Structure 1
Amino acid sequence: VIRNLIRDNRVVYGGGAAEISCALAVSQEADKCPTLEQYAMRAFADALEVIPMALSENSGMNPIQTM
């Protein structure tokens, strides 16, 4: 942690905030992919949400409603 903090001061907010923000960008940019990879780009967004969806499940909360 401290090694990466010193090597790069830039950091992002954990708790699944980054995975949810990345999923929204990938979902919007997937529309700009005129080829069969469009279905794969959408799948990358839903797959990114499993990390935050897993933290909600392990905490004893509804994963999808919290997602």
Structure 2
Amino acid sequence: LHDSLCVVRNLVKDSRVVYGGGAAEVTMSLAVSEEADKQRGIDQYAFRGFAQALDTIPMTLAENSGLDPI
């Protein structure tokens, strides 16, 4: 409940709602990735790191169900 409740005071503290199912996470893999190509330097691989990263939420989310993370 302290979850269900707090979730609502999240809406009170800052009204807005994204989309779950790792969906919110997936966006970064795309968006952030583009802002790395046109970034050049060494911050292209570091930022590409946030592509390598957010992929976990959907991966474990889905793998925890038995579906192929790939």
| TM bin (shorter chain) | 0.7 to 0.9
The TM-score normalised by the length of structure 2 is 0.84
Q: Could you say what the CA RMSD is over the residues aligned between the two structures, in angstroms?
A: 0.9
Q: Percent identity?
A: 64
> Which one has the largest radius of gyration?
2
1:14 alignment partner in structure 2 = 20
> Which residues of structure 1 form unaligned runs of 5+?
none
In structure 2, list runs of 5 or more residues that go unmatched: 1-6
Alignment of 1:22-61 (within 5 A): 22-61=28-67
TM-score, normalising length: structure 1: 0.87
Aligned residues: 64
